[PDB]
Write a protein that binds this ligand. Structure first.
Ligand code: G3I
Ligand code: 9MR
Ligand code: CA
Ligand code: ZN
Length: 530
């Protein structure tokens, strides 16, 4: 914990909420000054609990770089029309930096450029059958490509395009690595993952392979193109087949006016996968023998079936699908945004389907539960000193994604008539927290803020002789369970929000992931929209 001002290190929007935090004993006056020193704003800090005081400077609407002074402390804050444009662009460019089997040239990727990796065909587990499944994204700090979390990352990017296309239109991905005519930014980027996902479906059965990885994780020092271990397609799984089905039905709808062929191919692939679900058992995935990579296991598969049924309900607009969706919507499943508990994606597809195709009674019950869920998140946010919908127990592996999915839920609800008054405050507080307004004064994104992430658990950043890591990567965040040797050694006894370390070996607090950047893209695009 530093003895300084805690603020949004990326910046503040002209029209947005503006807040800073300080550990204090009582109210203190504060001032905002031009870089010359002239005061433009003055106020008093106010208590918010657990040693924290806040200062609100929302009314300062003139853009510039300001010196914020409180007691003997000083901080440089930025107010701008589109303060989050650069970070949003970097967060979307992260997906292109994760591209597998693709040359990333220096003119696009700069020092983190590299040649095509993992170009070999993968062997289907326990057979001699080889299969080509190039492309898509390296999942995280490792080089595996896993179906289940890939579906969430795709769904998030598609949702961001559907909700905030104007905000996304102001950002540029690695345009020259993608096929012309160029699609809008979120669709341009997500098409790479959608194309790889299509190669993961078994043509014979419609089932989808759980993942393609090497048998084990290579050293942290491994460059993408030096990872030459043989690739293995882990068996087909119910969770991979269902999440694929839902992500494909969603892409079929979104790509309809942009890529008719992709849309038609996705729609067909979604139907063949749903046919596989009807004929197979809800069997949880477990790593086969000799496969030591990310399992992405899950004992609860009803939420994945809910998402697949609701996604096809919306894709087709066919009331016949509500027969399967509605009993699933009645279950006491958590309504979350993944990677393991995906029911809220299904709830959203159901609520976004024309009203005529569904039971009005079920629809109203669904909308009421969503409102009650948001009220509970709002109460958590009300009692938190940083105003984020989190409790100490929520600071688990990928706590930044836990937070961002919750900000996402408020924003998603606005498109389906559930207008919670706290939605925009939560979105702003989640961005503030991610960018430095937290007990560690840590900006949880590489290459941004005054205290960026400098040592992520990310193979290309470790391997290169740059580190200085790849920019725009959202790290997992504080995890109180101390799920790595570094976290256990350095973070024992520390509060839940301080359970983070910027060290390359801390995979449990300092790794990156495509499905951690994906809700960040959605949340940041929402704020930019205004
Ligand atoms: O780290 C990112 C990727 C890197 N690529 C490989 C891939 O396998 C890895 O994925 C991560 O792999 C991790 C290791 O299994 C998963 O970590 C688990 O993440 C879960 C939440 O998603 C944690 O579960 C929570 O833990 C608490 C008590 O143990 C409970 O209060 C919570 O109920 C529970 O959900 C588990 O402890 C935890 O081990 C992550 O979510 C998942 O993001
Ligand atoms: O840091 C490299 C490995 C160290 N010891 C065993 C492995 O589990 C480590 O690899 C990391 O494991 C985590 C899987 O649990 C994973 O989330 C990271 O992607 C791996 O690099
Ligand atoms: Ca599940
Ligand atoms: Zn690769």
């Amino acid at each position: 914990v530093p003895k300084s001002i805690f603020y949004n290190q990326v910046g503040y929007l002209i029209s947005g909420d503006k807040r800073f935090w300080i550990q204090a004993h009582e109210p203190q006056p504060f001032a905002l000054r031009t870089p010359e020193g002239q005061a433009v704003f003055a106020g008093m800090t106010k208590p918010v609990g657990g040693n924290w005081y806040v200062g609100d400077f929302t009314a300062l609407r003139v853009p510039g770089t300001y010196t914020l002074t409180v007691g003997t402390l000083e901080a440089r804050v930025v107010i701008h029309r589109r303060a989050y444009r650069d970070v949003l662009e970097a967060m979307l460019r992260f997906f292109d930096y994760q591209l597998c089997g693709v040359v990333l040239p220096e003119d696009e990727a700069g020092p983190w450029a590299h040649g095509a990796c993992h170009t070999s065909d993968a062997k289907v587990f326990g057979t001699e059958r080889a299969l080509a499944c190039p492309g898509g994204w390296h999942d995280a700090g490792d080089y595996g490509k896993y179906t289940v979390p890939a579906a969430k990352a795709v769904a998030d990017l598609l949702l961001a395009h559907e909700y905030f296309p104007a905000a996304l239109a102001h950002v540029r991905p690695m345009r020259s690595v993608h096929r012309a005519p160029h699609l809008p930014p979120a669709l341009e980027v997500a098409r790479e993952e959608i194309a790889w996902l299509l190669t993961m479906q078994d043509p014979a059965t419609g089932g989808v392979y759980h993942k393609v990885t090497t048998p084990s994780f290579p050293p942290l020092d491994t460059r993408p193109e030096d990872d030459d271990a043989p690739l293995v397609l882990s068996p087909i799984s119910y969770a991979a087949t269902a999440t694929f089905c839902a992500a494909m039905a969603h892409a079929a709808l979104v790509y309809r006016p942009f890529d008719p062929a992709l849309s038609s191919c996705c729609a067909d692939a979604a139907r063949r996968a749903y046919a596989w679900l009807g004929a197979h058992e809800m069997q949880p995935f477990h790593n086969p023998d000799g496969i030591l990579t990310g399992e992405y296991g899950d004992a609860e598969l009803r939420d994945e079936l809910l998402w697949a049924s609701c996604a096809l309900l919306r894709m087709t607009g066919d009331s016949a699908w509500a027969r399967v969706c509605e009993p699933l919507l009645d279950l006491d499943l958590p309504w979350e945004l993944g990677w393991a508990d995906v029911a809220l994606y299904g709830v959203m597809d159901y609520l976004r389907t024309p009203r005529a195709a569904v039971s009005d009674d079920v629809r109203n019950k669904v909308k009421s539960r969503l409102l009650r869920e948001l009220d509970a998140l709002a109460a958590m946010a009300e009692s938190h000193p940083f105003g984020i919908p989190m409790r100490d127990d929520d600071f688990i592996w990928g706590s930044n994604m836990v937070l961002l999915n919750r900000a996402m839920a408020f924003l998603l609800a606005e498109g389906v008539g559930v207008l919670h008054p706290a939605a925009h405050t939560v979105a702003q507080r989640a961005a503030d927290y991610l960018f430095g307004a937290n007990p560690l004064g840590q900006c949880y994104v590489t290459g941004f803020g005054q205290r960026p992430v400098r040592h992520p658990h990310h193979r290309p950043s470790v391997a290169d002789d740059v580190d200085h890591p790849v920019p725009g990567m959202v790290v997992g965040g504080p995890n109180r369970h101390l799920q790595d040797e570094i976290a256990r050694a350095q973070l024992a006894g520390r509060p839940a929000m301080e359970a983070y370390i910027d060290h390359q070996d801390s995979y449990s607090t300092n790794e990156v992931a495509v499905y951690w950047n994906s809700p960040a893209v959605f949340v940041i695009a929402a704020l930019l929209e205004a």
